[PDB]
Design a protein around this motif. Structure first.
Motif, PDB file in Angstrom:
ATOM      1  N   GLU A 115     -46.442  96.602  72.507  1.00 40.07           N
ATOM      2  CA  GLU A 115     -46.013  95.310  72.405  1.00 40.07           C
ATOM      3  C   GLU A 115     -44.665  95.006  72.918  1.00 40.07           C
ATOM      4  OE1 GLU A 115     -46.029  94.947  68.220  1.00 40.07           O
ATOM      5  OE2 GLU A 115     -47.917  93.645  68.033  1.00 40.07           O
ATOM      6  N   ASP A 118     -44.912  94.779  76.850  1.00 36.72           N
ATOM      7  CA  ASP A 118     -45.787  93.833  77.173  1.00 36.72           C
ATOM      8  C   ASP A 118     -44.975  92.706  76.889  1.00 36.72           C
ATOM      9  OD1 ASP A 118     -47.605  91.239  76.335  1.00 36.72           O
ATOM     10  OD2 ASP A 118     -49.104  93.030  76.941  1.00 36.72           O
ATOM     11  N   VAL A 121     -42.181  92.384  79.774  1.00 39.12           N
ATOM     12  CA  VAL A 121     -43.142  91.751  81.084  1.00 39.12           C
ATOM     13  C   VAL A 121     -43.028  90.152  81.240  1.00 39.12           C
ATOM     14  CG1 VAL A 121     -45.239  91.188  82.022  1.00 39.12           C
ATOM     15  CG2 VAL A 121     -44.451  93.476  81.805  1.00 39.12           C
ATOM     16  N   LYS A 122     -43.442  89.773  80.030  1.00 40.64           N
ATOM     17  CA  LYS A 122     -43.270  88.132  79.636  1.00 40.64           C
ATOM     18  C   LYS A 122     -42.098  87.671  79.672  1.00 40.64           C
ATOM     19  CE  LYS A 122     -46.105  86.181  76.549  1.00 40.64           C
ATOM     20  NZ  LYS A 122     -46.604  85.594  75.322  1.00 40.64           N
ATOM     21  N   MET A 123     -40.898  88.346  79.122  1.00 44.02           N
ATOM     22  CA  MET A 123     -39.665  88.122  79.226  1.00 44.02           C
ATOM     23  C   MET A 123     -39.053  87.937  80.523  1.00 44.02           C
ATOM     24  SD  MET A 123     -37.781  90.050  76.054  1.00 44.02           S
ATOM     25  CE  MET A 123     -37.680  89.458  74.562  1.00 44.02           C
ATOM     26  N   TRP A 125     -40.871  87.511  83.293  1.00 43.35           N
ATOM     27  CA  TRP A 125     -41.467  86.310  84.096  1.00 43.35           C
ATOM     28  C   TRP A 125     -40.891  85.074  83.924  1.00 43.35           C
ATOM     29  CZ3 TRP A 125     -47.222  87.855  83.283  1.00 43.35           C
ATOM     30  CH2 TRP A 125     -47.432  89.076  84.152  1.00 43.35           C
ATOM     31  N   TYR A 126     -40.548  85.020  82.316  1.00 40.73           N
ATOM     32  CA  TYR A 126     -39.833  83.697  81.955  1.00 40.73           C
ATOM     33  C   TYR A 126     -38.555  83.583  82.211  1.00 40.73           C
ATOM     34  CZ  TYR A 126     -38.872  80.499  77.629  1.00 40.73           C
ATOM     35  OH  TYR A 126     -38.463  79.889  76.619  1.00 40.73           O
ATOM     36  N   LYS A 137     -41.766  88.312  90.324  1.00 39.95           N
ATOM     37  CA  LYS A 137     -42.567  88.845  89.208  1.00 39.95           C
ATOM     38  C   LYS A 137     -42.994  90.000  89.371  1.00 39.95           C
ATOM     39  CE  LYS A 137     -41.764  84.661  88.072  1.00 39.95           C
ATOM     40  NZ  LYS A 137     -42.538  83.437  88.024  1.00 39.95           N
ATOM     41  N   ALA A 152     -51.289  94.393  80.117  1.00 38.73           N
ATOM     42  CA  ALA A 152     -50.341  94.504  80.706  1.00 38.73           C
ATOM     43  C   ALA A 152     -49.565  95.676  80.686  1.00 38.73           C
ATOM     44  CB  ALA A 152     -49.214  93.190  80.476  1.00 38.73           C
ATOM     45  N   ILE A 304     -33.220  83.569  79.411  1.00 35.77           N
ATOM     46  CA  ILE A 304     -33.851  83.331  78.649  1.00 35.77           C
ATOM     47  C   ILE A 304     -33.749  81.970  77.297  1.00 35.77           C
ATOM     48  CG2 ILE A 304     -35.464  84.208  76.403  1.00 35.77           C
ATOM     49  CD1 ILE A 304     -35.259  86.943  78.266  1.00 35.77           C
ATOM     50  N   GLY A 315     -41.421  80.349  73.059  1.00 37.12           N
ATOM     51  CA  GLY A 315     -42.984  80.667  72.419  1.00 37.12           C
ATOM     52  C   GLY A 315     -43.713  82.007  72.652  1.00 37.12           C
ATOM     53  N   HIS A 316     -42.914  82.889  71.865  1.00 33.98           N
ATOM     54  CA  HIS A 316     -43.393  84.333  71.691  1.00 33.98           C
ATOM     55  C   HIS A 316     -42.673  84.760  70.428  1.00 33.98           C
ATOM     56  CE1 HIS A 316     -44.505  88.144  73.207  1.00 33.98           C
ATOM     57  NE2 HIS A 316     -43.252  88.692  72.911  1.00 33.98           N
TER      58      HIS A 316
ATOM     59  N   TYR B  15     -39.961  82.047  68.334  1.00 33.51           N
ATOM     60  CA  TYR B  15     -40.321  80.715  68.167  1.00 33.51           C
ATOM     61  C   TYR B  15     -39.153  80.054  67.518  1.00 33.51           C
ATOM     62  CZ  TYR B  15     -45.410  82.056  68.559  1.00 33.51           C
ATOM     63  OH  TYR B  15     -46.473  82.383  69.067  1.00 33.51           O
ATOM     64  N   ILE B 149     -50.011  86.811  71.295  1.00 33.78           N
ATOM     65  CA  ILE B 149     -49.149  86.640  72.601  1.00 33.78           C
ATOM     66  C   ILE B 149     -48.794  87.630  73.332  1.00 33.78           C
ATOM     67  CG2 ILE B 149     -48.167  84.278  71.532  1.00 33.78           C
ATOM     68  CD1 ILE B 149     -46.637  87.892  70.701  1.00 33.78           C
ATOM     69  N   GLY B 161     -47.653  75.619  74.647  1.00 32.23           N
ATOM     70  CA  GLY B 161     -46.195  76.092  74.347  1.00 32.23           C
ATOM     71  C   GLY B 161     -46.404  77.772  74.385  1.00 32.23           C
ATOM     72  N   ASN B 162     -47.428  78.363  74.340  1.00 33.26           N
ATOM     73  CA  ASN B 162     -47.333  79.919  74.793  1.00 33.26           C
ATOM     74  C   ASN B 162     -47.543  80.345  75.934  1.00 33.26           C
ATOM     75  OD1 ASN B 162     -48.955  79.480  71.610  1.00 33.26           O
ATOM     76  ND2 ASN B 162     -47.494  81.173  71.833  1.00 33.26           N
ATOM     77  N   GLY B 165     -43.921  78.640  81.436  1.00 31.58           N
ATOM     78  CA  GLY B 165     -42.773  79.599  81.456  1.00 31.58           C
ATOM     79  C   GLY B 165     -43.261  81.109  81.692  1.00 31.58           C
ATOM     80  N   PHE B 166     -44.468  81.165  81.190  1.00 33.24           N
ATOM     81  CA  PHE B 166     -44.893  82.843  81.199  1.00 33.24           C
ATOM     82  C   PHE B 166     -46.050  83.000  82.175  1.00 33.24           C
ATOM     83  CE2 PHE B 166     -43.707  82.241  76.546  1.00 33.24           C
ATOM     84  CZ  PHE B 166     -42.611  82.902  76.510  1.00 33.24           C
ATOM     85  N   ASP B 167     -46.308  82.064  83.246  1.00 36.94           N
ATOM     86  CA  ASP B 167     -47.325  82.335  84.337  1.00 36.94           C
ATOM     87  C   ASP B 167     -48.700  82.621  83.597  1.00 36.94           C
ATOM     88  OD1 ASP B 167     -44.917  82.145  85.710  1.00 36.94           O
ATOM     89  OD2 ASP B 167     -44.738  84.066  86.447  1.00 36.94           O
TER      90      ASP B 167
END
Ligand SMILES: Cc1ncc(COP(=O)(O)O)c(CN)c1O
Ligand SMILES: *Cc1c(COP(=O)(O)O)cnc(C)c1O
Lengths: 453, 451
Positions: A115, A118, A121-123, A125-126, A137, A152, A304, A315-316, B15, B149, B161-162, B165-167
């Motif tokens: 997690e 994973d 990775v999201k962070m 990209w954001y 990316k 991921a 971020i 949103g995470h 969140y 998520i 919302g999820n 910005g996260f592609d």
């Protein structure tokens, strides 16, 4: 109905052949104490892996257990969403930032390493979307690196066993070479020239892909599950120059190396890494509770942060992110490691382990003995000159681990390498017992193979 | 230096608006007891969300706490890799299969729901490769569904919302419509005709994409985080016919609905779902420990099993999969729910909740009141005829939740809907207090919106 029969009936086991498991059934572990675990037949084993590279304080540390109780009886569950917070998470995050080997800004909690990566990775990209670099990316990791097993994080992972049959890796996830000299250097190539070539491979991949498209590089300081692979001298220095040169983030996966495993508190210290982001788990809580932590530096946080504002909120988040019991246990776990000076002690015990194994350096089946600190591996081979396996790759490792277990020690084979990653609290004579049991297994394995010479 | 200053210095909150958090700081929760939590100023709040839809036995159940201690002092950590196992995981898996609403073969453990669904995705891809159907990989989920998520599970998730910005979503992750009558029915359309149209939308997507390419359909029996959306009558029956018709797996995400939330033990019971795969967490352990479980039926298991043999071993597993303390706590948690008959009690308390909220059906700001069992939501609107928000979507919900907190109740806003998902152990008068505090927040919100 017997307990093994129930297990065969009802559980699908991770990292297990399901059909073989229907035939053999489980090995049921009943209790633990110090560095030992005991099966349901009363038989005791030295857990030379600390479970999964993780049980730093062993299997019966009462202080961790009381810390759990105290938190349970205060606030057994709450969360960190929408500005909610709670003491253990806050105090743990404080501690983690103060002990970080480079300046770090914030902590984000998860349950697992998988997690965590994973999430990293999201962070990223954001982050790059926030900075107006929407093409930046792609992630670069290594062959045989292990970083978890979400869709991921398993794409970051560079072990084929984690990818076959899973349609992985995903697009955008790239792999350069395993920095393992013994297996991938050209004959007559020094460690330094091996490093040079790996750094050149990376630069070449960056250019071939478009520097503008490369967000991050991720690596375990030394690779755990892939073989206890120590990178060659100068690897990290040269790889970092290449990364700074193309504005690429450096992520240190310290899930195993973290908290005194490699001779210092972090693998980043041991190997001179100045990461932008660190990932922590395992010894964080001696695995008494499932928890992982991400450390991010100022630039990563500020980006971020701006974006979370623009979009209303970040949103995470996992339900268990920063769980008060897991964070409370981790906090106590880290205190104990400092108070009992276990980093320095692990280093000393590491020197013993390694010296003890090295009495076998000239054995006909021993190809390489490697490690640093209190993590090590002995890679067996059928022939030392060619470095070829006896029978198929993995045959020796599997036989050794089997024999070790017979002799009361649990080690994991990774191909034909057997690993050692004992609890940090292991004492001098326990290290001797570990080596003895390694030796008895080697002896058995040697009788079985009959090398001649 | 102060505890709130430390939090601002060192924690990135999920969140949460990070900049706003640097200004306001946290609300620090110090302790919990029964259905209440208390902040560091001593102030008590009814946790009407049970934390995160999860704390079934409330915040001070001693039996769960002892079960943890007993396991800790026996074996505080071990794993299930390479044929290793241990009693609590085994006994929990047994129980879960026993209590499953349809025949199930095996349990796989994770730490989180997000990990669970992420794992279900991998399992389905691995399954279909084993069966020689390498194109049968796509997942279909719904708009406003929430399934976690991770990169993959957030692609299952259908809340923008999820994803912004996260592609996300990833390719291969498809979304059909949110089964929410109040928002998406055509004027004068019945629930049944709404269901028909949704079932047709699905068939059409399957054909448009190629049935051979569609591996699975995933849904929460009723949608939690997306608004406590109850599907229209006949939705599940008709959607299942479409799925069986194209050999598509049905995955029930029971992370919230699981263990007595909806009036019966599972949302699959309440809504007549016969899933191939179920996903469980939250009330599984009253969130006293992080744990999730995947139940798979025989066909899914046999395929995965064959493949794990062909490939040497199943190359998947979390360090914390089946953690002995988390599994031990969950096992005790489930026993308690059975022994104290909390499914039936939750149902009764649910009736009270819903009947109490209904006194506000004619309030000028109330667009819809919905729920079943002990989960419910009141959706506020700026105008009832048009159903439009005051100002912009989420403004009312944010203000309500704020006011509720002021009045000693913690609820979560989902847009302009405020949710209720209290602990199962809530008593009659506590349900009254919840409704009263809802009412005071509504009053405040009404004065705020004003003439
Ligand atoms: C229906 C559903 N599924 C999956 C998840 C993911 O759970 P976790 O937070 O444990 O990853 C959630 C979390 N709220 C949920 O409500
Ligand atoms: C074991 C491991 C992980 C994954 O952590 P989980 O908690 O098992 O998801 C990640 N990174 C490394 C380096 C690991 O060794």
């Amino acid at each position: 109905s017997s307990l093994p029969e129930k297990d065969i009936q009802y559980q699908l086991h991770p990292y297990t052949n399901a059909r073989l498991h229907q035939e053999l059934g489980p090995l049921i572990i009943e209790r633990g104490e110090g560095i030992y675990v005991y099966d349901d037949q009363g038989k005791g084993y030295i857990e030379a892996m600390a479970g999964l590279w993780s049980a730093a304080l062993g299997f019966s540390n009462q202080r961790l257990i009381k810390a759990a109780e105290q938190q349970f009886n205060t606030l057994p569950f709450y969360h960190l969403f929408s500005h909610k917070s709670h003491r253990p998470s806050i105090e743990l995050a404080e501690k983690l930032i103060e002990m970080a080997p480079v300046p770090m800004s914030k902590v984000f909690f998860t349950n697992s390493g998988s997690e965590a990566n994973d999430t990293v990775v999201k962070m990223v990209w954001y982050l790059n979307n926030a900075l107006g670099k929407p093409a930046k990316k792609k992630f670069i990791s290594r062959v045989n690196g292990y970083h978890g097993i979400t869709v991921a994080s398993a794409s970051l992972t560079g072990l084929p066993g984690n990818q076959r049959g899973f349609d992985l890796p995903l697009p955008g996830f790239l792999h350069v070479g395993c920095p393992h000299h013994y297996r991938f250097a050209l004959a007559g190539e020094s460690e330094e020239h091996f490093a040079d070539r790996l750094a050149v491979e990376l630069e070449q991949k960056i250019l071939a892909e478009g520097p503008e498209t490369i967000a991050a590089f991720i690596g375990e300081p030394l690779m755990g599950a892939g073989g206890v692979i120590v990178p060659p001298r100068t690897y990290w220095e040269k790889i970092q120059k290449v990364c700074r040169k193309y504005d690429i983030l450096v992520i240190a996966d310290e899930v195993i190396c973290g908290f005194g495993r490699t001779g210092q508190m972090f693998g980043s210290q041991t190997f001179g890494i100045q990461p932008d982001i660190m990932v922590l788990s395992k010894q964080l809580s001696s695995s008494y509770q499932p928890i992982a932590a991400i450390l991010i530096n100022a630039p990563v946080f500020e980006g971020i942060a701006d974006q979370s504002q623009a979009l209303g909120a970040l949103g995470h988040g996992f339900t268990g992110s920063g769980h008060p019991v897991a964070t409370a246990v981790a906090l106590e776990n880290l205190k104990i490691i400092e108070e009992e000076s276990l980093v320095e002690h692990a280093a000393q015990m590491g020197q013993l382990l390694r010296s003890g194994l090295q009495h076998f350096i000239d054995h006909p089946l021993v190809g390489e003995i490697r490690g640093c600190g209190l993590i090590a591996a002995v890679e067996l081979v059928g022939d030392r000159v060619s470095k070829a396996p006896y029978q198929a790759l993995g045959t020796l490792g599997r036989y050794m681990a089997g024999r070790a277990q017979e002799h009361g020690m649990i080690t994991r084979a990774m191909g034909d390498a057997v690993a050692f990653c004992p609890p940090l609290i292991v004492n001098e004579q326990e290290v001797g017992m570990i080596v003895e049991r390694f030796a008895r297994a080697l002896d058995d394995t040697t009788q079985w193979v009959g090398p001649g010479g």
